[PDB]
Amino acid sequence: MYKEPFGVKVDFETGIIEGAKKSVRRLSDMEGYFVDERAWKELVEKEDPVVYEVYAVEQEEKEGDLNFATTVLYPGKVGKEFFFTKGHFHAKLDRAEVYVALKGKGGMLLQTPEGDAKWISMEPGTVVYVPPYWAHRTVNIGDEPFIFLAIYPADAGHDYGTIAEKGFSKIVIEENGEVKVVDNPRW
C-alpha cells in the first residue's frame, strides 16, 4: 500500500519541524570528541550545555526513499575548539546528502575514509553537496545558533564509530581572533 504524502512546516528561525522526532545532544554526550579534555570536563561538570538538537522526519530504511532533518547547532567552544556535531560516515558509504543552511555562521568538515579533509563554509542559503563516501561534521563558527536542513537517503544510516575513535584529521579553532582549520594533534 502507498504511503501518504504530507507537508510539514519548518521554521527557518528555530529549525523546528512539525511532527518530527527530537534528539538532544549535550556536551556530556560527547566524551572523547574534543581535543581539550580538560576544557571539556570543566564545561560538562559546570553546566553541560546542549551542543545540538536534531528534528528528524525519517522513513523505514529502504532504497530510494528519503529522510530529512534540521539540526540546531549551538554556539560555543571547548577550549579553542568550536562546537560541532559528532560527525559520521554513512553505513551505506556510497549514500550522498544535501544540506541547506538556514541560519547562522558555520561550516562543514568533510573527510574521506583515508582522512583527506575538506572544509566548506556555510551561511544561510548555502547548499552543500556531501558526495558518496565522505564523513561529515558541521561546526558553528559564530555567536548564534547554526541551523541547517539535511536530506539523506532513508537507507544511508549512520556510522559514528570510526570518527568517535580517531576524530577528523582536522580541527576547527579560534586562534588570534581568526577561525582556522588545522591539523588535529590526536590524529
Next chain:
Amino acid sequence: MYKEPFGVKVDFETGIIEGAKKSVRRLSDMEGYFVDERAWKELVEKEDPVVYEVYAVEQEEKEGDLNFATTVLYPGKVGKEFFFTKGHFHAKLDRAEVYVALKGKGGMLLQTPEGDAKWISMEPGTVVYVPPYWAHRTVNIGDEPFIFLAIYPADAGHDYGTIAEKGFSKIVIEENGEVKVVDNPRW
C-alpha cells in the same frame, strides 16, 4: 577517486542557484496539458509566457546519490487553471523526493498509478514528502512567483508520458475568486 564536496549559494528570493543548469518552460512547451485548449492556444499567441524555470545541480544516475533543483513557477492561469509544472512519476517508481517551499503560494498535486489524488498546500517553509509511487506536479495559486527547492534521488529519473497523455485525475482552478481542486473532466 571520490567526488569533490562543494557548496553553492541558493538565493531564496529569486530561486537562482549560482552556476546551475537552467531550464525554461514556456507555455508553448506545454501543449496537451491544460483543460482549456483554446485558452492555451490564445495565451501562447498573445504572449507565450515562461511558465517555470528550473536551476538544477545534478549528479550521474547512480543509486544513493542525490540531485537538487530550484523551480521558479510563475504566476498565471490557462482559462481557469493555475500555472503548474508538467508533473511526472519517476522512472524508478519507488524513488521519493523532498521539496522545500522558499517563496510564494502554491501547492503540490500528487497521484498514484491508479489515479488516486492528493493536494498539499505549500507556503514558505513547508516541506513536502513525496513518497515512492506518487507522481507530482506543483501549482502556483498566487500572483507572485512560487519558488521551491527539490532534492531527489539521482537515479529516480523523470517519466512524463503517463501524465502528458491523460493528465492528473484532478485540476486546480480559480472559481469565484477561490482556489478549487476538482475532478479533471478530460481524465
